[PDB]
Design a protein around this nucleic acid. Structure first.
Ligand SMILES: [Mg+2]
Ligand SMILES: [Mg+2]
Ligand SMILES: [Mg+2]
Ligand SMILES: [Mg+2]
Ligand SMILES: [Mg+2]
Ligand SMILES: [Mg+2]
Ligand SMILES: [Mg+2]
Ligand SMILES: [Mg+2]
Ligand SMILES: [Mg+2]
Ligand SMILES: [Mg+2]
Ligand SMILES: [Mg+2]
Ligand SMILES: [Mg+2]
Ligand SMILES: [Mg+2]
Ligand SMILES: [Mg+2]
Ligand SMILES: [Mg+2]
Ligand SMILES: [Mg+2]
Ligand SMILES: [Mg+2]
Ligand SMILES: [Mg+2]
Ligand SMILES: [Mg+2]
Ligand SMILES: [Mg+2]
Ligand SMILES: [Mg+2]
Ligand SMILES: [Mg+2]
Ligand SMILES: [Mg+2]
Ligand SMILES: [Mg+2]
Ligand SMILES: [Mg+2]
Ligand SMILES: [Mg+2]
Ligand SMILES: [Mg+2]
Ligand SMILES: [Mg+2]
Ligand SMILES: [Mg+2]
Ligand SMILES: [Mg+2]
Ligand SMILES: [Mg+2]
Ligand SMILES: [Mg+2]
Ligand SMILES: [Mg+2]
Ligand SMILES: [Mg+2]
Ligand SMILES: [Mg+2]
Ligand SMILES: [Mg+2]
Ligand SMILES: [Mg+2]
Ligand SMILES: [Mg+2]
Ligand SMILES: [Mg+2]
Ligand SMILES: [Mg+2]
Ligand SMILES: [Mg+2]
Ligand SMILES: [Mg+2]
Ligand SMILES: [Mg+2]
Ligand SMILES: [Mg+2]
Ligand SMILES: [Mg+2]
Ligand SMILES: [Mg+2]
Ligand SMILES: [Mg+2]
Ligand SMILES: [Mg+2]
Ligand SMILES: [Mg+2]
Ligand SMILES: [Mg+2]
Ligand SMILES: [Mg+2]
Ligand SMILES: [Mg+2]
Ligand SMILES: [Mg+2]
Ligand SMILES: [Mg+2]
Ligand SMILES: [Mg+2]
Ligand SMILES: [Mg+2]
Ligand SMILES: [Mg+2]
Ligand SMILES: [Mg+2]
Ligand SMILES: [Mg+2]
Ligand SMILES: [Mg+2]
Ligand SMILES: [Mg+2]
Ligand SMILES: [Mg+2]
Ligand SMILES: [Mg+2]
Ligand SMILES: [Mg+2]
Ligand SMILES: [Mg+2]
Ligand SMILES: [Mg+2]
Ligand SMILES: [Mg+2]
Ligand SMILES: [Mg+2]
Ligand SMILES: [Mg+2]
Ligand SMILES: [Mg+2]
Ligand SMILES: [Mg+2]
Ligand SMILES: [Mg+2]
Ligand SMILES: [Mg+2]
Ligand SMILES: [Mg+2]
Ligand SMILES: [Mg+2]
Ligand SMILES: [Mg+2]
Ligand SMILES: [Mg+2]
Ligand SMILES: [Mg+2]
Ligand SMILES: [Mg+2]
Ligand SMILES: [Mg+2]
Ligand SMILES: [Mg+2]
Ligand SMILES: [Mg+2]
Ligand SMILES: [Mg+2]
Ligand SMILES: [Mg+2]
Ligand SMILES: [Mg+2]
Ligand SMILES: [Mg+2]
Ligand SMILES: [Mg+2]
Ligand SMILES: [Mg+2]
Ligand SMILES: [Mg+2]
Ligand SMILES: [Mg+2]
Ligand SMILES: [Mg+2]
Ligand SMILES: [Mg+2]
Ligand SMILES: [Mg+2]
Ligand SMILES: [Mg+2]
Ligand SMILES: [Mg+2]
Ligand SMILES: [Mg+2]
Ligand SMILES: [Mg+2]
Ligand SMILES: [Mg+2]
Ligand SMILES: [Mg+2]
Ligand SMILES: [Mg+2]
Ligand SMILES: [Mg+2]
Ligand SMILES: [Mg+2]
Ligand SMILES: [Mg+2]
Ligand SMILES: [Mg+2]
Ligand SMILES: [Mg+2]
Ligand SMILES: [Mg+2]
Ligand SMILES: [Mg+2]
Ligand SMILES: [Mg+2]
Ligand SMILES: [Mg+2]
Ligand SMILES: [Mg+2]
Ligand SMILES: [Mg+2]
Ligand SMILES: [Mg+2]
Ligand SMILES: [Mg+2]
Ligand SMILES: [Mg+2]
Ligand SMILES: [Mg+2]
Ligand SMILES: [Mg+2]
Ligand SMILES: [Mg+2]
Ligand SMILES: [Mg+2]
Ligand SMILES: [Mg+2]
Ligand SMILES: [Mg+2]
Ligand SMILES: [Mg+2]
Ligand SMILES: [Mg+2]
Ligand SMILES: [Mg+2]
Ligand SMILES: [Mg+2]
Ligand SMILES: [Mg+2]
Ligand SMILES: [Mg+2]
Ligand SMILES: [Mg+2]
Ligand SMILES: [Mg+2]
Ligand SMILES: [Mg+2]
Ligand SMILES: [Mg+2]
Ligand SMILES: [Mg+2]
Ligand SMILES: [Mg+2]
Ligand SMILES: [Mg+2]
Ligand SMILES: [Mg+2]
Ligand SMILES: [Mg+2]
Ligand SMILES: [Mg+2]
Ligand SMILES: [Mg+2]
Ligand SMILES: [Mg+2]
Ligand SMILES: [Mg+2]
Ligand SMILES: [Mg+2]
Ligand SMILES: [Mg+2]
Ligand SMILES: [Mg+2]
Ligand SMILES: [Mg+2]
Ligand SMILES: [Mg+2]
Ligand SMILES: [Mg+2]
Ligand SMILES: [Mg+2]
Ligand SMILES: [Mg+2]
Ligand SMILES: [Mg+2]
Ligand SMILES: [Mg+2]
Ligand SMILES: [Mg+2]
Ligand SMILES: [Mg+2]
Ligand SMILES: [Mg+2]
Ligand SMILES: [Mg+2]
Ligand SMILES: [Mg+2]
Ligand SMILES: [Mg+2]
Ligand SMILES: [Mg+2]
Ligand SMILES: [Mg+2]
Ligand SMILES: [Mg+2]
Ligand SMILES: [Mg+2]
Ligand SMILES: [Mg+2]
Ligand SMILES: [Mg+2]
Ligand SMILES: [Mg+2]
Ligand SMILES: [Mg+2]
Ligand SMILES: [Mg+2]
Ligand SMILES: [Mg+2]
Ligand SMILES: [Mg+2]
Ligand SMILES: [Mg+2]
Ligand SMILES: [Mg+2]
Ligand SMILES: [Mg+2]
Ligand SMILES: [Mg+2]
Ligand SMILES: [Mg+2]
Ligand SMILES: [Mg+2]
Ligand SMILES: [Mg+2]
Ligand SMILES: [Mg+2]
Ligand SMILES: [Mg+2]
Ligand SMILES: [Mg+2]
Ligand SMILES: [Mg+2]
Ligand SMILES: [Mg+2]
Ligand SMILES: [Mg+2]
Ligand SMILES: [Mg+2]
Ligand SMILES: [Mg+2]
Ligand SMILES: [Mg+2]
Ligand SMILES: [Mg+2]
Ligand SMILES: [Mg+2]
Ligand SMILES: [Mg+2]
Ligand SMILES: [Mg+2]
Ligand SMILES: [Mg+2]
Ligand SMILES: [Mg+2]
Ligand SMILES: [Mg+2]
Ligand SMILES: [Mg+2]
Ligand SMILES: [Mg+2]
Ligand SMILES: [Mg+2]
Ligand SMILES: [Mg+2]
Ligand SMILES: [Mg+2]
Ligand SMILES: [Mg+2]
Ligand SMILES: [Mg+2]
Ligand SMILES: [Mg+2]
Ligand SMILES: [Mg+2]
Ligand SMILES: [Mg+2]
Ligand SMILES: [Mg+2]
Ligand SMILES: [Mg+2]
Ligand SMILES: [Mg+2]
Ligand SMILES: [Mg+2]
Ligand SMILES: [Mg+2]
Ligand SMILES: [Mg+2]
Ligand SMILES: [Mg+2]
Ligand SMILES: [Mg+2]
Ligand SMILES: [Mg+2]
Ligand SMILES: [Mg+2]
Ligand SMILES: [Mg+2]
Ligand SMILES: [Mg+2]
Ligand SMILES: [Mg+2]
Ligand SMILES: [Mg+2]
Ligand SMILES: [Mg+2]
Ligand SMILES: [Mg+2]
Ligand SMILES: [Mg+2]
Ligand SMILES: [Mg+2]
Ligand SMILES: [Mg+2]
Ligand SMILES: [Mg+2]
Ligand SMILES: [Mg+2]
Ligand SMILES: [Mg+2]
Ligand SMILES: [Mg+2]
Ligand SMILES: [Mg+2]
Ligand SMILES: [Mg+2]
Ligand SMILES: [Mg+2]
Ligand SMILES: [Mg+2]
Ligand SMILES: [Mg+2]
Ligand SMILES: [Mg+2]
Ligand SMILES: [Mg+2]
Ligand SMILES: [Mg+2]
Lengths: 64, 200, 143, 115
RNA sequence: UAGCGGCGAGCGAACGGGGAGGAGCCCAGAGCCUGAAUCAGUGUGUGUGUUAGUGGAAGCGUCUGGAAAGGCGCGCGAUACAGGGUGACAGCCCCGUACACAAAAAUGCACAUGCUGUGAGCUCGAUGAGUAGGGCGGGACACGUGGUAUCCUGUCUGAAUAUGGGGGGACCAUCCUCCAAGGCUAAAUACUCCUGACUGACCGAUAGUGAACCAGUACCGUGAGGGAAAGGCGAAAAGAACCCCGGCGAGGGGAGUGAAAAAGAACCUGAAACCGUGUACGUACAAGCAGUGGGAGCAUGCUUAGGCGUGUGACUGCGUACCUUUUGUAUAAUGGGUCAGCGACUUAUAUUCUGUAGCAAGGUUAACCGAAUAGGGGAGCCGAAGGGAAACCGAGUCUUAACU
């Protein structure tokens, strides 16, 4: 039988052109007033997954 | 390009079908795959599940001075188990059309260099009789052969069933292993024309 | 060539690692899997994305977006595979016969992938600004 | 394709039990015990090719030291005497000459006395 | 994949395509006209098949051996060289095989077709109420009540019934599409206790069924139930008449049979552990993983007028087994009485990476159709383009009012 994708991971990562994955930053859901604007601005755009935790992502979603 | 032995007619055959470099690996792979396809692969041992016997522990976990057992059927016991029991499986393996054609083009061109390929005009026995076919190969100086024919005659077919070292395949039904196995290959001018078009 | 004389290409075959066959094998006694622990055990090893009970990367990061319904039924036609249909007419049903785009694709777009020669009148199809220069430079008039 | 392994195993055990030939009790008879003895024999064999070179040097040196002191010189001074006269002859031969040809040997102790 | 999901573990569609196989009808009823085309009788009829079967080709001589099918040399049938037996390996000795043929009698099929028996036609109307739907509670849908369409229902209720009603995934309105609340339907599909044939990169007596053998037997259990072990003399019994020791025993020695009887039934081969009998050397003042380097003598094999093999090993330097597990084991930590046999990284499909072969901006088919490892069949898949949450734009695009 075929491999099943870890769907939760499929809803948190997207495959870029090279091979790496874009993901949304943590710490931008609630408790925002105490955080500085500079943080919240820097956390807004998407970000690339680090080379340490890339193998864990590549395993859990083998399709795309 | 291929002279005959009772005519000397210039049958101009295509260059890149009957005149190529012998790719050994491709041919090897195709003949190995063809061989692997010949398997039926019918066999089965029975796992510790499938053996007849109870699930019961014969003796308990502790207490007695004896190695902890859990089943009569366990593969380390006698008369029960076979750890990795075989299941009936299909050993046939995929061969790419272009690889199969390429291997045929490779082997069928090597027969021209080795002089196994004896191209001929009309090849057919008079009546459905082995005695005549066996007698006519004496003049042709042949023994272990693959008589390929476009128009497959029943008269010729029936007359080569009992002959072991002779085989009579149709021009459509050439094989990788057959072309290599037999010591000569006798192709009819029509069969060369059909095989030329088939391999292309 | 005989049925015996055939042999494979060097490097094609590689035998295979056979675990638990003496010292001389190299791997043998603990078949390349060390001493004890969960990973040494038969049917061992943790599941995917398991970081020792720490909250995994695929759960500590937030989930984003929504899968579009329209994106599933729209194609990106390569301009290289443009003049392979019916002379110089590429509506939709004509393009579908040439097996360039899938059956359930109503919307489709011609991007600048390079190389056109023949004039192609692109009807009933969305065209890119770079492809609009190319298609017209080749000859054909869009819409 | 089931592979019986009675022919090959026997040949493996029988090979080692041939090397164990001469050992005491089980060590010759019983594979499980013999195999250890045959390995140990190998380890000791490997070791003792090193010690053979040591022992014999001592054996020679003792003979030379014995034969030198008959003529009234000690080994330590004798070898220095030979070295200082650029004599290249080894212990092995000095020991052989010491036993066999003493009238010859005596000349080396004089040759050493010069230095 | 879309979704579902303590949005965890996991579970997982349809539209849509390519195939296999294709087939439709009866009722909730009134005219003329009529039994007709449909199911099924039951014949009888080919055609069969299945359950008995018949014929079925052509070798000889020497050599070795117990025996010839063997080697050697010459023949011959082959639509028969599948396979088996036969005193060793048989195309031609025998049984088969290809092929050619069979049925008194019973039956399983496919068409004529006499028929107790059954309605072809257009009609004219009908067109399935405690029902659809709703509330409550459960369930089935990939879909866990969620924004939840859909279906079924335990419970309580209730339309319109073609000017009508269902559906198109909360819902509404427009369009499209169907017609619920009754039935019946071959094929493609699943399976094999069982009957045949035929095939194995299946096993070959600790294997293969538990069971090659009088095995679901012996034996165990109150019982449900569990459940063994145990194959082979030889070509042919020619299975040892007769003597001799012995208890007119066992058991032997003969003699005989055979090619062979250490093939004599406790019967091919006959390993190892283990237990012996005889020959050579060593061994009763000598301390320990029992070996290992040195090494006299003695005994045999050889070539000899040197010594070199082989068995033995006085005496002597060094030397605390193996495995496991450990920071670390001679350890007084684990495991092993020994031998023989068996006993542990496998198999299937997905996936990424390395090698290798094909062809190359292409590569490539899946089921299937082929009797067929050909060749079709590109439905698909993957790649050649990405950015964005997405519409959308695209060698750019996102961000942003706009970006050095
Ligand atoms: Mg937010
Ligand atoms: Mg801050
Ligand atoms: Mg601030
Ligand atoms: Mg602040
Ligand atoms: Mg995919
Ligand atoms: Mg069971
Ligand atoms: Mg149980
Ligand atoms: Mg129980
Ligand atoms: Mg105990
Ligand atoms: Mg014990
Ligand atoms: Mg058994
Ligand atoms: Mg078994
Ligand atoms: Mg087993
Ligand atoms: Mg397989
Ligand atoms: Mg495989
Ligand atoms: Mg295949
Ligand atoms: Mg194919
Ligand atoms: Mg041959
Ligand atoms: Mg064929
Ligand atoms: Mg190699
Ligand atoms: Mg190798
Ligand atoms: Mg191999
Ligand atoms: Mg393998
Ligand atoms: Mg292995
Ligand atoms: Mg290694
Ligand atoms: Mg190692
Ligand atoms: Mg490893
Ligand atoms: Mg371990
Ligand atoms: Mg540990
Ligand atoms: Mg570990
Ligand atoms: Mg396990
Ligand atoms: Mg597990
Ligand atoms: Mg959300
Ligand atoms: Mg397509
Ligand atoms: Mg595509
Ligand atoms: Mg490009
Ligand atoms: Mg075998
Ligand atoms: Mg064994
Ligand atoms: Mg043995
Ligand atoms: Mg041998
Ligand atoms: Mg061993
Ligand atoms: Mg032996
Ligand atoms: Mg010795
Ligand atoms: Mg000794
Ligand atoms: Mg022994
Ligand atoms: Mg012995
Ligand atoms: Mg030295
Ligand atoms: Mg896809
Ligand atoms: Mg939903
Ligand atoms: Mg919850
Ligand atoms: Mg949500
Ligand atoms: Mg849909
Ligand atoms: Mg469809
Ligand atoms: Mg479908
Ligand atoms: Mg369709
Ligand atoms: Mg079928
Ligand atoms: Mg059909
Ligand atoms: Mg069809
Ligand atoms: Mg019909
Ligand atoms: Mg029909
Ligand atoms: Mg009909
Ligand atoms: Mg009759
Ligand atoms: Mg009949
Ligand atoms: Mg008939
Ligand atoms: Mg008949
Ligand atoms: Mg019959
Ligand atoms: Mg018959
Ligand atoms: Mg006959
Ligand atoms: Mg004869
Ligand atoms: Mg003779
Ligand atoms: Mg004779
Ligand atoms: Mg005789
Ligand atoms: Mg003969
Ligand atoms: Mg004869
Ligand atoms: Mg003669
Ligand atoms: Mg001759
Ligand atoms: Mg001859
Ligand atoms: Mg034959
Ligand atoms: Mg035969
Ligand atoms: Mg045959
Ligand atoms: Mg014999
Ligand atoms: Mg025989
Ligand atoms: Mg033979
Ligand atoms: Mg013969
Ligand atoms: Mg035969
Ligand atoms: Mg013959
Ligand atoms: Mg012959
Ligand atoms: Mg017949
Ligand atoms: Mg007749
Ligand atoms: Mg008759
Ligand atoms: Mg008949
Ligand atoms: Mg008859
Ligand atoms: Mg008949
Ligand atoms: Mg009759
Ligand atoms: Mg009769
Ligand atoms: Mg009859
Ligand atoms: Mg009858
Ligand atoms: Mg009406
Ligand atoms: Mg109706
Ligand atoms: Mg109606
Ligand atoms: Mg109705
Ligand atoms: Mg009513
Ligand atoms: Mg009513
Ligand atoms: Mg409804
Ligand atoms: Mg409603
Ligand atoms: Mg409704
Ligand atoms: Mg209801
Ligand atoms: Mg309410
Ligand atoms: Mg409800
Ligand atoms: Mg559920
Ligand atoms: Mg819930
Ligand atoms: Mg549910
Ligand atoms: Mg519910
Ligand atoms: Mg709600
Ligand atoms: Mg939920
Ligand atoms: Mg939700
Ligand atoms: Mg919600
Ligand atoms: Mg609705
Ligand atoms: Mg509702
Ligand atoms: Mg439903
Ligand atoms: Mg319903
Ligand atoms: Mg009312
Ligand atoms: Mg009303
Ligand atoms: Mg009504
Ligand atoms: Mg009314
Ligand atoms: Mg409606
Ligand atoms: Mg509705
Ligand atoms: Mg639906
Ligand atoms: Mg309209
Ligand atoms: Mg209903
Ligand atoms: Mg109905
Ligand atoms: Mg009814
Ligand atoms: Mg029908
Ligand atoms: Mg069947
Ligand atoms: Mg075997
Ligand atoms: Mg076998
Ligand atoms: Mg047995
Ligand atoms: Mg046996
Ligand atoms: Mg058995
Ligand atoms: Mg046995
Ligand atoms: Mg059993
Ligand atoms: Mg019995
Ligand atoms: Mg009882
Ligand atoms: Mg029991
Ligand atoms: Mg019991
Ligand atoms: Mg037994
Ligand atoms: Mg017997
Ligand atoms: Mg017999
Ligand atoms: Mg026999
Ligand atoms: Mg016999
Ligand atoms: Mg007798
Ligand atoms: Mg007497
Ligand atoms: Mg008595
Ligand atoms: Mg008496
Ligand atoms: Mg008497
Ligand atoms: Mg007796
Ligand atoms: Mg007697
Ligand atoms: Mg006797
Ligand atoms: Mg006699
Ligand atoms: Mg005799
Ligand atoms: Mg005789
Ligand atoms: Mg003999
Ligand atoms: Mg004899
Ligand atoms: Mg005799
Ligand atoms: Mg005898
Ligand atoms: Mg005799
Ligand atoms: Mg014997
Ligand atoms: Mg014998
Ligand atoms: Mg006797
Ligand atoms: Mg007897
Ligand atoms: Mg007895
Ligand atoms: Mg017996
Ligand atoms: Mg016995
Ligand atoms: Mg025999
Ligand atoms: Mg024997
Ligand atoms: Mg014996
Ligand atoms: Mg015997
Ligand atoms: Mg023996
Ligand atoms: Mg023995
Ligand atoms: Mg022995
Ligand atoms: Mg013993
Ligand atoms: Mg004794
Ligand atoms: Mg003895
Ligand atoms: Mg004795
Ligand atoms: Mg003595
Ligand atoms: Mg003393
Ligand atoms: Mg003494
Ligand atoms: Mg002692
Ligand atoms: Mg001491
Ligand atoms: Mg000591
Ligand atoms: Mg020694
Ligand atoms: Mg020595
Ligand atoms: Mg001597
Ligand atoms: Mg000592
Ligand atoms: Mg010491
Ligand atoms: Mg020691
Ligand atoms: Mg030590
Ligand atoms: Mg431990
Ligand atoms: Mg400790
Ligand atoms: Mg110890
Ligand atoms: Mg130590
Ligand atoms: Mg202890
Ligand atoms: Mg303890
Ligand atoms: Mg211990
Ligand atoms: Mg341990
Ligand atoms: Mg412990
Ligand atoms: Mg242990
Ligand atoms: Mg113990
Ligand atoms: Mg063993
Ligand atoms: Mg076993
Ligand atoms: Mg593995
Ligand atoms: Mg790659
Ligand atoms: Mg690569
Ligand atoms: Mg490479
Ligand atoms: Mg390569
Ligand atoms: Mg290229
Ligand atoms: Mg078919
Ligand atoms: Mg055909
Ligand atoms: Mg045919
Ligand atoms: Mg087939
Ligand atoms: Mg695709
Ligand atoms: Mg490019
Ligand atoms: Mg993208
Ligand atoms: Mg894109
Ligand atoms: Mg823009
Ligand atoms: Mg925007
Ligand atoms: Mg913008
Ligand atoms: Mg902008
Ligand atoms: Mg601005
Ligand atoms: Mg700007």
């Amino acid at each position: 039988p075929k491999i099943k994708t870890v769907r939760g991971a499929a809803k948190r990562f997207k495959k870029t052109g090279k091979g790496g994955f874009k993901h949304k930053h943590a710490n931008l859901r609630h408790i925002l007033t105490k955080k500085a604007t500079k943080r919240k601005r820097h956390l807004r755009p998407k970000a690339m997954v680090s080379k340490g935790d890339l193998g864990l992502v590549i395993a859990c979603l083998p399709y795309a | 390009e291929l002279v005959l032995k009772d005519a000397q007619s210039a049958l101009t055959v295509s260059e890149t079908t009957f005149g190529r470099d012998f790719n050994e690996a491709l041919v090897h792979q195709v003949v190995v795959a063809y061989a692997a396809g010949a398997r039926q692969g019918t066999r089965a041992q029975k796992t510790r599940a499938e053996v007849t016997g109870s699930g019961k522990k014969p003796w308990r976990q502790k207490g007695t001075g004896r190695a902890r057992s859990g089943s009569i059927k366990s593969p380390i016991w006698r008369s029960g188990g076979v750890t990795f029991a075989a299941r009936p499986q299909d050993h046939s393996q995929k061969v790419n059309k272009k690889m199969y054609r390429g291997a045929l083009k490779s082997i069928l061109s090597e027969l021209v260099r080795q002089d196994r390929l004896i191209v001929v005009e009309k090849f057919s026995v008079e009546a459905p009789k082995t005695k005549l076919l066996a007698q006519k190969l004496k003049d042709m100086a042949l023994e272990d052969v693959l008589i390929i024919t476009g128009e497959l005659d029943e008269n010729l077919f029936l007359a080569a069933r009992n002959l072991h070292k002779v085989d009579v395949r149709d021009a459509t039904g050439i094989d990788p292993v057959s072309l290599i196995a037999f010591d000569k290959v006798v192709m009819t001018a029509d069969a060369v024309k059909q095989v030329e078009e088939m391999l292309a | 060539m005989r049925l015996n004389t055939l042999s494979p290409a060097e490097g094609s075959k590689k035998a295979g690692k056979r675990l638990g066959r003496g010292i001389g094998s190299g791997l043998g006694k603990t078949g390349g899997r060390g001493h004890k622990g969960q990973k040494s055990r038969s049917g061992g090893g943790v599941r995917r994305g398991f970081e020792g009970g720490q909250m995994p990367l695929y759960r500590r990061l937030p989930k984003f977006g929504f899968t579009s319904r329209k994106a599933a039924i729209t194609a990106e036609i390569r301009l290289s595979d443009l003049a392979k249909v019916e002379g110089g007419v590429v509506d939709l049903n004509t393009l579908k016969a040439a097996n360039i785009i899938g059956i359930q694709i109503e919307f489709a777009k011609v991007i600048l992938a390079g190389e056109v020669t023949t004039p192609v009148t692109v009807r009933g199809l969305r065209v890119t600004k770079g492809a609009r220069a190319a298609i017209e430079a080749a000859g054909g008039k869009i819409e | 394709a089931r592979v019986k392994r009675g022919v090959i195993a026997r040949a493996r055990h029988k090979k080692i039990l041939k090397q164990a030939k001469g050992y005491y009790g089980a060590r010759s008879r019983v594979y499980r015990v013999a195999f250890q003895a045959v390995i140990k024999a190998g380890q000791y064999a490997y070791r003792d090719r090193r010690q053979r070179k040591r022992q014999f040097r001592q054996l020679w040196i003792a003979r030379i030291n014995a034969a030198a002191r008959q003529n009234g010189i000690s080994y330590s001074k004798f070898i220095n005497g030979l070295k200082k006269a650029s004599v290249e002859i080894d212990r092995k031969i000095l020991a052989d000459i010491a036993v066999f040809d003493k009238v010859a040997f005596t000349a080396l102790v004089e040759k050493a006395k010069a230095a």
